[PDB]
């Protein structure tokens, strides 16, 4: 029947009918009666609308403003927007359902209906459905019977006769082919939309293959599940199940936990991007010279104020490194600085000459050339990249001393926080005084010095790497502090030569060479300086309390590397402050609600309340709120500095053990299922990271002091 409609109706009409019928997910080869009905309706609507225009006077004419605007055949959105526009302009009532035509001469919507049964039934049905005495309804029949609203047939007798003869011809064609019976009998359900989604072909066989073992086809499985009822299947299967499949609760008594088993090997060495406790800084007081903000000029002034430079020499060679290259790099830095000092208009930034020493130190031309595999098939000596595990390293005593130093109180302020709005609410005043306490106790902590140092270094490295990708750039490690006298002081820790920084992935690394002044003899703890190559670069005349003492001043020179993510999280190191302060504040609040008053002054000034924070040969030691705040800040800062997968894994797998211990101390009768498995999981994360090893030792001490 689709062929007949295609061969009879106009191509425009057939295409429009197909478009209208497909909008609701209808196929035109199987659902053919609806297709023919839509085609006939569209043809009747077009003939009704066509051949009728409005003259400039405003009267109907037959051969310019069209008399009838067509609304049928357009998409739902297009039809509804045209209807809305006409309704808004002409001011007529908005039809509840989508009409077919609009008459401008009388300004009303007209519904065109083509039906096969008697006209009165269809007219009554349509009138009841629309239920509005504002839109005209015109029913046409293939038998030659037409009915209108109030018998008002606006179309001229000639047009109605033409439509009637067209419908009669269509009906005669239907009858001649012996298909008018189905066409007449299918009209009842044409208005109903039935969804079809049948699995056939490849997908049917795929479904047949996705069933439990004892099924052969999807319909069989569907029939089985449809008739499925529950009768003791779970109980029977459980009875058949072996009793060895169980979850035995092993009590977690005070004698159950055991210390973690730290790894064995050579002591772990320092891996920070810069010295923490061994760093020496050359300082200038109240910088008011030329520049005052450019790192190079500040470095120049810092180096100028110190007299006593001597010939550098290797004292602690890097075992795997070419120490002469490090020596020549330091000499080249000194020569470049002198050359710049010679010139008048020193630039904001400097590029170091790509000498051989910098070529080797910065790892230039070390990566094998990358070639697409299509042109690498003929090579017979290919080997997969190594994926060996990290070398185990034992816990060393220097990391504990470094953490102890990081928690110390400093004389000079290290962060000068910005202003905020005026305080009006009482809560605002309480916040202000508590913030004053926290800032006083935190701005004078060495952890804040490390925060500022790392933030500045990472920011400068990122800026240099992105701005200059092909230049070996010199970056002095500059920091700003305020001494106990309140005078701005500019400190220089050394220099960083940044190599090529063509970073594409977040994990790509930039090699650089760090040279840091120090007063720590590398031979006291050589294992701590495995990767460095320490030089004795001067003799510093320190002003001791008793008097003046001459001490050697060394330069720790090493090659390090960092990535875009590492630099990014280095810039965001001030957040560490919050991680402590928040907690500290909570603690204070956690006590204040108990005493119905703010205990900040009591906690900070009188130091009446102390928390167990340190271990001594005498025993566990209690520190005041300030000490706890500094300890938490240092812990967070070291987390930032010594971040690694090992730290994350250890924290994740040890929070469970900490919570179990807390439950045991709460007399909640804690229980475990594979506590040995948990211990193995925790110990798998301790390999070589000094920070992780220190944390594991800390956890062992906590377990020892908490089991009792």
């Amino acid at each position: 029947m689709e062929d007949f409609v295609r061969q009879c109706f106009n191509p425009m009409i057939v295409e429009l009918a197909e478009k209208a019928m497909k909008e609701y997910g209808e196929d035109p080869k199987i659902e053919t009666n609806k297709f023919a009905s839509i085609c006939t309706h569209l043809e009747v609507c077009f003939m009704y609308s066509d051949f009728h225009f409005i003259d400039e006077r405003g009267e109907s004419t037959i051969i310019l403003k069209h008399r009838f605007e067509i609304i049928e055949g357009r998409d739902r959105t297009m039809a509804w927007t045209v209807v809305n526009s006409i309704c808004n302009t002409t001011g007529v009532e908005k039809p509840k359902f989508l009409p077919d035509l609009y008459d401008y001469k009388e300004n009303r919507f007209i519904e065109i209906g083509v039906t096969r049964r008697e006209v009165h039934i269809y007219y009554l049905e349509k009138a009841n459905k629309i239920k509005s005495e504002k839109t005209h309804i015109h029913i046409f029949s293939f038998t030659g019977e037409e009915m209108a609203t109030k018998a008002d047939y606006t179309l001229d007798e000639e047009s109605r006769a033409r439509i009637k003869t067209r419908l009669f011809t269509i009906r005669q064609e239907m009858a001649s082919r012996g298909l008018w019976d189905s066409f007449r009998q299918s009209e009842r359900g044409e208005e109903t939309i039935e969804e079809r989604f049948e699995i056939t072909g490849t997908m049917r066989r795929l479904a047949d293959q996705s069933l439990p073992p004892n099924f052969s086809s999807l319909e069989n499985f569907r029939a089985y599940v449809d008739g499925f009822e529950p009768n003791g299947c779970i109980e029977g299967k459980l009875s058949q199940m072996s009793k060895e499949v169980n979850a035995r609760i092993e009590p977690f008594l005070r004698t159950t936990p055991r210390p973690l088993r730290l790894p064995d090997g050579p002591p772990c060495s320092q891996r920070s991007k810069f010295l923490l406790m061994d760093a020496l800084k050359l300082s200038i007081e109240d910088p008011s010279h030329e520049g005052e903000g450019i790192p190079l000029y500040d470095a120049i002034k810092c180096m100028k104020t110190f007299f006593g430079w001597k010939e550098p020499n290797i004292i602690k060679p890097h075992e795997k490194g070419i120490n002469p290259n490090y020596l020549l790099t330091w000499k080249q830095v000194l020569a470049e600085l002198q050359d710049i000092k010679n010139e008048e208009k020193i630039p904001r930034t400097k590029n170091m000459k790509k000498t051989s020493q910098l070529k080797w130190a910065l790892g230039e031309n070390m990566a094998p050339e990358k070639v697409d595999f299509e042109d690498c098939k003929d090579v017979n000596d290919l080997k997969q990249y190594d994926s060996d595990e990290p070398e185990p390293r034992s816990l060393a005593c220097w990391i504990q001393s470094e953490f102890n130093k990081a928690c110390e109180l400093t004389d000079s302020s290290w962060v000068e926080l910005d202003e905020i709005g005026e305080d009006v609410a009482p809560i605002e005043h309480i916040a202000s005084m508590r913030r004053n306490y926290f800032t006083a106790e935190v701005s004078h902590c060495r952890a804040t010095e490390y925060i500022m140092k790392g933030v500045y270094i990472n920011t400068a490295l990122l800026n240099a790497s992105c701005a200059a990708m092909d230049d070996f750039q010199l970056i002095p490690m500059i920091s700003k502090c305020i001494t106990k006298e309140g005078r701005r002081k500019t400190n220089l820790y050394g220099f960083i030569i940044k190599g090529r920084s063509h970073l594409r992935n977040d994990t790509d690394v930039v090699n650089f060479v760090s040279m840091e002044f120090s007063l720590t003899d590398p031979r006291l703890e050589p294992h701590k300086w495995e990767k460095y190559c320490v030089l004795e670069i001067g003799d510093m005349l320190l002003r001791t309390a008793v008097g003046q003492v001459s001490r050697p001043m060394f330069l720790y020179v090493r090659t390090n590397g960092t990535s875009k993510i590492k630099m990014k999280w280095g810039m965001e190191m001030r957040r560490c402050l919050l991680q402590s302060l928040q907690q500290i504040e909570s603690m204070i609040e956690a006590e204040s609600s108990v005493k119905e008053k703010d205990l900040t002054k009591e906690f900070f000034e009188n130091k009446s309340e102390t928390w167990p924070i340190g271990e001594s040969p005498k025993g566990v030691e209690e520190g005041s709120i300030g000490k706890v705040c500094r300890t938490l800040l240092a812990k967070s800062v070291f987390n930032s500095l010594y971040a690694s997968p090992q730290l994350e894994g250890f924290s994740a797998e040890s929070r469970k053990l900490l919570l179990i211990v807390q439950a045991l101390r709460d007399n909640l009768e804690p229980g475990t299922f594979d506590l040995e498995g948990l211990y193995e999981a925790i110990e798998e994360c301790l390999i070589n990271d000094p920070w992780v090893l220190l944390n594991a030792s800390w956890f062992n001490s906590f377990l020892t002091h908490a089991l009792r």
Binding site: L280, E441, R543, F604
Partner: peptide
């Protein structure tokens, strides 16, 4: 006003004085 203090507190080896 609040000056931090530590009951646990030569030449400050990290930040010494060297000006002649």
């Amino acid at each position: 006003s609040y000056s931090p203090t530590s009951p646990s507190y030569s030449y400050s080896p990290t930040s010494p004085s060297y000006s002649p």
